[PDB]
Structure 1
Amino acid sequence: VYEATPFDPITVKPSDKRRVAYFYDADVGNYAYGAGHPMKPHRIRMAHSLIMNYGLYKKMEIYRAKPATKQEMCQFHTDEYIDFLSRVTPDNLEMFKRESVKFNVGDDCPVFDGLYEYCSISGGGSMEGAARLNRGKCDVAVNYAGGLHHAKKSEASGFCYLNDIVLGIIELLRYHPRVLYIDIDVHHGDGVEEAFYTTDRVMTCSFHKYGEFFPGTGELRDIGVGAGKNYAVNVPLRDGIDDATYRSVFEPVIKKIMEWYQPSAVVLQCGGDSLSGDRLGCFNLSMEGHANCVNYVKSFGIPMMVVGGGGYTMRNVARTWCFETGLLNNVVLDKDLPYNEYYEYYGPDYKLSVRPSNMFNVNTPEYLDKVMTNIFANLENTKYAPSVQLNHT
């Protein structure tokens, strides 16, 4: 149930305009995991620079959100976990050797100076975006410091220490029946799916790479337990997938979810380890291919909350985030970067482009046909009973 097509020029439709609320905090870039770690918050700062220098700040409203409190963190995490996060420093680690062993701390998720403050910034931005979306102020709410989707209710997993998306969706659920979550990282969005697995009010939908990969979960037959059965959609894919392939897989899945699940608040993870040239991912996506997802999720017209995620080559996350943010404002930018304080990092021709490679696509019309047919089948037990008057979602 899949025919491959060419990839069409990304283009903003004029019948709908948004009120973008952008959340940024000039502190966040100032934290660093360690010497050689692939996770660098500095890239968020870099994206800010382009937003300033392209003249893009002049059609949205830029806010610092107050950091999240300990008891707002314990809405999803345990007390022992959050107390550990709050008390552990790179200097006293020797007095937490049990807890570090017990909470999955030390090599893939080390402790740096400012861990708790960085987590506070992420969670605060996500929850304040959600709250401002509930009050009918904004339509889209952008927070690139959040999207640490691999964190466990009691465990640090995969460069992530606090699941701010869970808190955001918990705040979105106070006023909404049904919330959709889309995850276009190259890894599986496993923290959010484990958190909302046995419910029907959050539908998680991941597009990931399944193999000898990370985290190791998210098969085509993992679809929810309990009353949450058929409310967890996985799309496993193989190396090399490019813009045309990805677009032809991504659009009909999302459109059928919108027609059946009828959600009326979307959260969108826009991770950047799914770009060509990334140092951990293995897809072959362009910048237009990675941004057409955002453009399509926006062409529906329900409250969106866009967040960050992965992206381990700083230049490419910065450029694609700035381009996506320009697209949310109905603006297709220009390709020549303006002079900014990071007018390096953008060799060799200093443009607004992410370039794909020629590596080979290991995904063919039959694997995808089979996957999408299984999904379309799983995805018809998730409607609303005929007598249930809605609010035109």
Structure 2
Amino acid sequence: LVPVYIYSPEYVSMCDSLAKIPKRASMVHSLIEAYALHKQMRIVKPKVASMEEMATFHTDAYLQHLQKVSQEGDDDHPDSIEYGLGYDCPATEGIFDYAAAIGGATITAAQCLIDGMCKVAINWSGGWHHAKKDEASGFCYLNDAVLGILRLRRKFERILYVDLDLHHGDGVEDAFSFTSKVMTVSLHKFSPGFFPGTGDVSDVGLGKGRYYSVNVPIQDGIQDEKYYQICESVLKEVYQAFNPKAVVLQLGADTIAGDPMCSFNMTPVGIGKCLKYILQWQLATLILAGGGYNLANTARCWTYLTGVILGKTLSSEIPDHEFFTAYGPDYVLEITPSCRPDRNEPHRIQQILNYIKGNLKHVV
């Protein structure tokens, strides 16, 4: 029926106290609210994830250590480095409750999908795709995307994970790399020295999960038209070969022109065409956020995509609201691609697609 929107004022406040995206959650919700899109959705308060729900993926030793160091924010504990806590993922005070709130919000969205409350459920504070079962990684302490998929596996027999973040969704792919019940598809920048360094087209999963991982390595400067051509080509073949019953879609906005990552050169319109293509499958769909470090452009992107989900065309002027002064110098919703080259050679892209086409022939 109506798409579910995972939201509460306390959840956004909890998300807002995050070292890496300060006030991002407030800016996203407040722009969505300023366009009145929340009136067209079913607002659902997130439950926080129990220990047993987090342990569907993460080990008990990791969870208990995260819980301990989160007490005083002790970031000198001797075992922290063994769990990936330190540089990118400091053991700050309250980090465990913060991670459990976000994980629980993604689980809540998945539970809404199982219960038939909706066919699209949105958590614009989720998508933390780097965390492994026993190790934090790339600013991710818990892998809410994995937790969401595992919740959807209570009902759905084949789940398609699509990861459109700038970065390779290595934590999700690693979680499911030995199984054929969950297919992972990631489009991402892949370049020697670019985080996390995995996800070449030759990485196709392991064992019984061989060919149930799809990786599309892409180079700097890609724009909307070519990105959609790649994405539609891959998802068309994946949908035919895999026949998913549900979809989890990670829509990190660090691909968008103006992001400090300064890598891809996308606008939300291009990401929106990929989203529209997945939406016409009419499957249960769990929508997650991800990266995005130009805060106004990130709000622009996820608001526009919320309008796409609702089939609404939005006014170009950013409406008057709390963060209006952040949308300069132009104060419009549309984003202009930067003037810099697309480094993607058409023949390399086509060779990549041919490989994936061959890998997918093996798919059942």
Query: Which TM-score applies when normalising by structure 2?
Result: 0.96
* Correspondence 1:49-88 to 2 at 5 A: 49-88=30-69
Q: Deviations over 1:77-131 (max 9, x none)?
A: 111111111121484526x521222111112111233312211221111111111
Instruction: Determine if the alignment matches structure 1 residue 159 to structure 2 residue 139.
Output: yes
- Quote how far apart the aligned CAs of 1:354 are: 1.7
* Correspondence 1:277-316 to 2 at 5 A: 277-316=258-297
Contact 1:121–1:145 (Cα < 8 Å) also in 2: no
Identify the structure with bigger relative contact order (alpha carbons < 8 Å, sequence gap 6+).
1
- Report what 1:32 is aligned to: 17
Contact 1:25–1:121 (Cα < 8 Å) also in 2: no
Instruction: Determine if the alignment matches structure 1 residue 343 to structure 2 residue 324.
Output: yes
- Quote how far apart the aligned CAs of 1:53 are: 1.6
Q: Deviations over 1:150-169 (max 9, x none)?
A: 00111110011000111111
Whole-Å Cα distance in 2 between the matches of residues 234 and 172 of structure 1?
Answer: 22
Whole-Å Cα distance in 1 between the matches of residues 262 and 103 of structure 2?
Answer: 25
Cα distance, 1:92–1:354 mapped onto 2, change above 3 Å: closer
Whole-Å Cα distance in 1 between the matches of residues 22 and 125 of structure 2?
Answer: 8
Q: Deviations over 1:238-285 (max 9, x none)?
A: 111111110111111101111111001000000011111111250000
Contact 2:73–2:93 (Cα < 8 Å) also in 1: no
What's the secondary structure of 1:174's corresponding residue? coil
Whole-Å Cα distance in 2 between the matches of residues 295 and 276 of structure 1?
Answer: 20
Q: What is the identity, as a one-letter code, of the residue corresponding to 2:162?
A: I
Whole-Å Cα distance in 2 between the matches of residues 241 and 116 of structure 1?
Answer: 37
Corresponding residue to 2:255 among 269, 274, 283:
274
Q: How many pairs were matched up?
A: 361
Q: What is the identity, as a one-letter code, of the residue corresponding to 2:17?
A: A
Where structure 1 has 5 or more consecutive residues not aligned to the other structure, the ranges are 1-17, 384-393
Where structure 2 has 5 or more consecutive residues not aligned to the other structure, the ranges are none
Q: What is the identity, as a one-letter code, of the residue corresponding to 2:118?
A: C
Instruction: Determine if the alignment matches structure 1 residue 376 to structure 2 residue 342.
Output: no
Query: Which TM-score applies when normalising by structure 1?
Result: 0.89
Corresponding residue to 2:184 among 192, 200, 204:
204
* Correspondence 1:1-393 to 2 at 5 A: 18-27=1-10, 28-30=12-14, 31-34=16-19, 39-40=20-21, 42-89=23-70, 91=72, 93=74, 96-211=76-191, 212-383=193-364
Whole-Å Cα distance in 1 between the matches of residues 256 and 89 of structure 2?
Answer: 23
- Quote how far apart the aligned CAs of 1:33 are: 4.2
What's the secondary structure of 1:373's corresponding residue? helix
Q: What is the identity, as a one-letter code, of the residue corresponding to 1:82?
A: L
What's the secondary structure of 1:379's corresponding residue? helix
What's the secondary structure of 1:256's corresponding residue? helix
Contact 2:73–2:92 (Cα < 8 Å) also in 1: no
What's the secondary structure of 1:362's corresponding residue? coil
Larger Rg: 1
Contact 1:183–1:205 (Cα < 8 Å) also in 2: yes
Whole-Å Cα distance in 2 between the matches of residues 155 and 26 of structure 1?
Answer: 30
Whole-Å Cα distance in 2 between the matches of residues 74 and 89 of structure 1?
Answer: 17
Whole-Å Cα distance in 1 between the matches of residues 117 and 111 of structure 2?
Answer: 9
Runs of 4+ aligned structure 1 residues displaced above 6 Å come to none
Whole-Å Cα distance in 2 between the matches of residues 106 and 281 of structure 1?
Answer: 26
Of Structure 1 and Structure 2, the greater helix share is in 2
Whole-Å Cα distance in 2 between the matches of residues 33 and 135 of structure 1?
Answer: 31
Whole-Å Cα distance in 2 between the matches of residues 158 and 25 of structure 1?
Answer: 26
Contact 1:198–1:224 (Cα < 8 Å) also in 2: yes
Q: What is the identity, as a one-letter code, of the residue corresponding to 2:140?
A: C
Q: What is the identity, as a one-letter code, of the residue corresponding to 2:213?
A: A
Q: What is the identity, as a one-letter code, of the residue corresponding to 2:206?
A: V
Output the aligned Cα RMSD: 1.4
Identical columns (%): 42
